[PDB]
Write a protein that binds this ligand. Structure first.
Ligand SMILES: *[C@@H]1O[C@H](CO)[C@@H](O)[C@H](O)[C@H]1NC(C)=O
Length: 235
């Protein structure tokens, strides 16, 4: 999907206009950029066993492909090779980088494709065929889990509602920390773009059960976590 990157096509324009003249006969100049640009546009068409091929990536993965690719092209041009060898090395490289990029696209589906064990993650994906963006809703468990927090008295209580994938989700509203009781009622204790609720000098009254809802834009919360806090008198 690499050609979906504005910098690759720049490197190609500069490749033809600035590197092709000095090092390639013009009898073969526009006739080669065809083969090349279609070899780049073929990165889209891959496959690797042990999985299918979603035909989709993320910015994080596109940037690796583009980088890893343009680095070696830079190796090529830096060498100043210019014969009927230039056209050999260029495409050997063009094969190998297809391999490497294929590995990248594998790691992406295996690990970074909807990596939430719970909640709703809005993940920006790029369709490789048409180089176009869509926001994909990754849906899993409603409530992520339950945290058991034990804290000694006079220590600081720290409730964390942040997960490894919140920094990568989108359309996120604030974190809200509510307080639940027997009253059946609950009072919002905190609300902001801080993923943690810290209450200093915890007491027997601070113990109980809290809840954290990470809001999303025009939707249900991305994450809900229930904290069960209990207090010890040690120290
Ligand atoms: C729940 O308890 C708190 C403190 O005990 C109190 O402020 C609140 O009014 C209670 N809710 C009821 C009684 O509905």
């Amino acid at each position: 999907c690499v050609i979906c990157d504005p910098s690759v096509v720049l490197a190609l324009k500069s490749l033809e206009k600035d590197y092709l003249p000095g090092h390639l006969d013009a009898k073969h100049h526009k006739a080669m950029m065809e083969r090349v640009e279609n070899a780049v546009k073929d990165f889209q068409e891959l496959s690797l066993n042990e999985d299918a091929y979603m035909g989709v990536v993320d910015e994080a993965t596109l940037q690796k492909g583009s980088w890893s690719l343009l680095k070696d092209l830079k190796r090529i041009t830096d060498s100043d090779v210019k014969g009927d060898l230039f056209v050999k090395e260029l495409f050997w490289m063009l094969h190998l980088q297809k391999e490497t990029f294929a590995t990248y696209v594998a790691r992406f589906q295996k690990e970074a494709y909807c990596p939430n064990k719970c909640g709703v993650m809005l993940q920006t994906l790029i369709w490789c065929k048409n180089c176009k963006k869509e926001v994909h809703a990754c849906r899993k468990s409603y409530d992520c889990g339950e945290r058991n927090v034990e804290v000694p008295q006079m220590e600081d209580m720290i409730l964390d509602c942040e997960l490894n994938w919140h920094q990568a989700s989108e359309g996120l509203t604030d974190y809200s920390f509510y307080r639940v009781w027997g009253n059946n009622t609950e009072t919002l204790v905190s609300k902001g773009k801080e993923a943690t609720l810290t209450k200093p000098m915890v007491g027997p009254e601070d113990a109980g059960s809290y809840r954290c809802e990470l809001g999303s834009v025009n939707s249900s919360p991305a994450t809900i976590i229930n904290f069960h806090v209990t207090v010890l008198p040690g120290r």
